[PDB]
Design a protein around this ligand. Sequence first.
Ligand SMILES: N[C@@H](Cc1ccc(O)cc1)C(=O)O
Ligand SMILES: N[C@@H](Cc1ccc(O)cc1)C(=O)O
Lengths: 483, 485
Amino acid sequence: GVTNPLDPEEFRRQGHMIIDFLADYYRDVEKYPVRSQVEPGYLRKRLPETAPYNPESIETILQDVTTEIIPGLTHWQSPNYYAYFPSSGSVAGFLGEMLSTGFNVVGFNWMSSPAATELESVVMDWFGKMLNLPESFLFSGSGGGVLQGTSCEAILCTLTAARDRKLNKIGREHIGRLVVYGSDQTFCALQKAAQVAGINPKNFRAIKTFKENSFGLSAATLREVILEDIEAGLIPLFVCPTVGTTSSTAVDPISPICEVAKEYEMWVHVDAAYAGSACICPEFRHFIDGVEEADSFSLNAHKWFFTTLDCCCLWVKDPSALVKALSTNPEYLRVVDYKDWQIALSRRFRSLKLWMVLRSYGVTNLRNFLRSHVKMAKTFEGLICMDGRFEITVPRTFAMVCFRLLPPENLVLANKLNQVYLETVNATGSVYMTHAVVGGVYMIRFAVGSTLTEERHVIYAWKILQEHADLILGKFSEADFSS
Amino acid sequence: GVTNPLDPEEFRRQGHMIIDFLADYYRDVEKYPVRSQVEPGYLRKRLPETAPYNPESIETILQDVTTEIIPGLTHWQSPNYYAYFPSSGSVAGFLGEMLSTGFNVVGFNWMSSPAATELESVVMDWFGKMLNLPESFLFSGSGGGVLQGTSCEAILCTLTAARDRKLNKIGREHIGRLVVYGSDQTFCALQKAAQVAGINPKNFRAIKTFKENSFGLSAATLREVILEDIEAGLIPLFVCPTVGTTSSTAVDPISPICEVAKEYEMWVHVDAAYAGSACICPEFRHFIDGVEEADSFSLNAHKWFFTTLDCCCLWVKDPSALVKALSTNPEYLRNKVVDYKDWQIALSRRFRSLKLWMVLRSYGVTNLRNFLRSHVKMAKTFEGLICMDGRFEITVPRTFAMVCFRLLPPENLVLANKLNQVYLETVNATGSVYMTHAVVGGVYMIRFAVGSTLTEERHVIYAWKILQEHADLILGKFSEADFSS
Ligand SMILES: N[C@@H](Cc1ccc(O)cc1)C(=O)O
Ligand SMILES: N[C@@H](Cc1ccc(O)cc1)C(=O)O
């Protein structure tokens, strides 16, 4: 008669069906154009206007996924995807999320699924020790780690925790004087968190950075601005040094910034969404030096640690600060109750993802995985240096190379050249790279990170970059880009 | 040599294993005690203290999943789970997340994956029309819909959009005078969202409700509280009526509340996290009557619509209000292709539209309506069995497939409350079933929320038998002195 929507046998049948469908995808992903080539509004035309009144077969659905959905995909998993930052996936991360989705438990509290809580605390100490974080950030010591969806939610949590920590001492009425600090290379995650958290929009600070420091935030520039804010009657609150900025993978010196922050009793959050995972390797651990003097530390494991979207790792020194701000139980009362550490009350069993990756691949292989990406970028950097028509614009730090083609006001012309050049490369569908404008210079970002990417794909990307370079420069006229 | 972590053939081999592992789980889930019986800290002792340097096999991990993880699970998907609101799943929903996790794209913007954005706008118009929402909430009309993770996240965005809308008019310095209104039955999503958004803690209102109104918020009482706040120099900002409260599944009258809210220029968010999905059935659509006069509306499709955790559906009349508060573009560019990150907190958006799309297609509106009807029928049957047993009592009117009841003794309330506390915990400890409680109007009452996808009528009858047998046991040896402490 009526089949249960969760029938075990029908679950097994369609389950194996989609597994093969996805294994075929990973096998054939190279045939698709990396950047989707559909036009805006294509999918509403091809789909009905209302939901069907009668059921449709999974076979019919999967066919529409092939003909209607896949064309509208920009293949983050394609081995020739070098845009933005890596959507790092793996087999282990996938299985952990399907076991999480199969169990389908709600981690509202410890009793709703004790394993959904304790396993998270264990793997966060695993991951933290691999990062060689101090004991002040671990359950082993006096700290604590929590898994969240994205970095912006994590930063929003530490921000409100820092906000409540100060306002509870000086009075809630001073919220309009709290100042959030960052560099002009910081992304929305900080400004967006400040907006949601009630910080006054005129009190967000994007401190200028200079080419002389590879656009890392200078603590000296930070102290000047803070003194300007204190003279204006403002209250310094929150500074977010970034290790591996989005634009050029810039690195803010954490230790000098913490020294400035403690003098003014400021919360320090280290934003390592992308590059943080590389600190598992001892030769990269120096990038988060000074994190021992910060209040929180966050990285997106889905950016460069194979878990698949999404899995943000937040380590804090004082979990009570989060609970004091995010819990809804009365203030006086304010086992681990993770729902008081983040925004989400209906937490997902996210620890299985990170638990599978750490066990399936182990520390030794995980270090070399990250090292292989950096080495492929270091090879791409070596190919650029050998072609006199190109230029490395900033120092490579983590597996991403920023470069630009050079022309044979001059900066304005060069920016237009690289914009047109890059767009013709992306329009082929063979590879995909995004750009950035740092210090007024238009530059191309090559972020090696996709799990399927091998050295042949990076060399293949270099050949296309050269062939289009031969194309635009061979017929170059500065009047074609002087508009 | 080392194999690529995303090798297609290894993905195929291990993927089929997990599917068989989960199918076996759904087949045998009844054998586990519903509420986990492990002690706190059991898992830190059974697992190593560091990560392994060398890889471990999927066969080794899966066995550890069986012996270490599953024992520490409270089986929301067990057919004998009637505790908190349902964790509604299905095959179609599971396959949606699997495809979403498989593709593993990031919906940062339209370009990052056009299908990840456009499919969301289409299915939200699908679900909205199923709910008979006015076109002001649809992309066909004036409004739009967005997919988020949880309702508290959706309520936070809706609240900040209401906050910025007001403060942009009168000034940012008045954030300390904005008041957020709810009932004593509203959930902490409203309170938690107020705290994060910068609302002063002393400006959160939990308006008292009464048994005379089944604990639904009275618009007359709301207006009284507003006048006191206005007379005290405060700004009313945001009222959040709830259809299907968490404790007694109470319902607030939307139409008279928006009438009060329109008088004082207040944002109205209709919170229907659990009961919202039931309104695709015409006989239940009356519960969200008056939503035409609210600003936003939210339900949890993972609570009662077979998507899987997580999937929150938020419709708004004015999406630009969300963009103005959540976008990071300068304020003069927000003041003018969908960009869904500007509708929520998360920038790195997940391909959540697949879940909802797979559920709507795989089952259809007709079968989806009947699915919810079967849960309500089973609950109403559970209600009938209780009325036929003179020892039990229905504490509040049942509205959406959840029944509230209590065991009666042969103040009396303190005794009856202690009886049901002992009665309930003795039943839950058996592991045969799991039901949570709530203290509404000073009365301790047991909650029977029928919602687990695998729950059939035989499980409901089985839970009634367990309740009757324990009722015979507790009352058979009853003494006032055993509960008067
Ligand atoms: N938000 C990132 C893009 C990104 C987000 C999430 C990812 O998993 C990967 C890449 C950026 O602007 O660069
Ligand atoms: N917040 C719910 C718990 C819950 C959350 C999500 C669900 O899908 C189900 C139940 C409660 O306290 O009752």
